[PDB]
């Protein structure tokens, strides 16, 4: 229905605004672009599904997310990719891991404060009907 297409349009507006707020935070610069294949040729042998905030915006605009739960699966993949590639005790790996945990926690805290639970449940029930 047109009412259902208006629901998904409001979801995309909400997701673009959360993603912009994460992308402008200086802590999260390292997550705003893909890990570059030239500079790190090893990366794509270890990490089988790369993800970053530029790819997330492109996915919003391609209508890949019908719920906030499917958006948070990609924010969780950004964070778990960084924990698995950079697991060592040295300061450069510990700094990346602390930033990855902060990007995940910050996304979940904005959603807990600003997403209406009945709006999410509506998106879930339209998705489950299709």
Ligand X SMILES: O=C(C1CCC1)N1C[C@@H]2C[C@H]3C[C@@H](O)[C@@H](O)[C@]2(C1)O3
49 near ligand X, rule: CB under 6 A: no
CA neighbor of 70 nearest in space, from 16, 6, 15: 15
Q: Are 57 and 95 in contact (CB under 8 A)?
A: no
Closer CB to ligand X, residue 11 or residue 78? 78
* Shortest Å, Cβ 112 to ligand X: 24
Q: Are 76 and 104 in contact (CB under 8 A)?
A: yes
Stretch that binds ligand X, among 7-15, 68-76, 78-86, 104-112 (CB under 6 A): 78-86
Interacting residue ranges for ligand X, rule: CB under 6 A: 30-31, 35, 39-40, 43, 82, 85-86, 96
């Amino acid at each position: 229905s047109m009412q259902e297409e208006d629901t998904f349009r409001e979801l995309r507006i909400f997701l673009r605004n959360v993603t912009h707020r994460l992308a402008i935070d200086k802590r999260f610069r390292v997550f705003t672009k893909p890990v570059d294949p030239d500079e790190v040729p090893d990366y794509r042998t270890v990490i089988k599904e790369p993800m970053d905030l530029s790819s997330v915006i492109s996915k919003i605009d391609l209508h890949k997310y019908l719920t906030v739960k499917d958006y948070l699966r990609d924010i969780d993949l950004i964070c778990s990719n960084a924990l698995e590639y950079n697991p060592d005790r040295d300061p450069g790996d510990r700094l990346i891991r602390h930033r990855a945990c902060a990007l995940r926690d910050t996304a979940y805290a904005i959603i807990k404060e600003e997403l209406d639970e009945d709006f999410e449940q509506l998106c879930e029930e339209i998705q489950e009907s299709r």
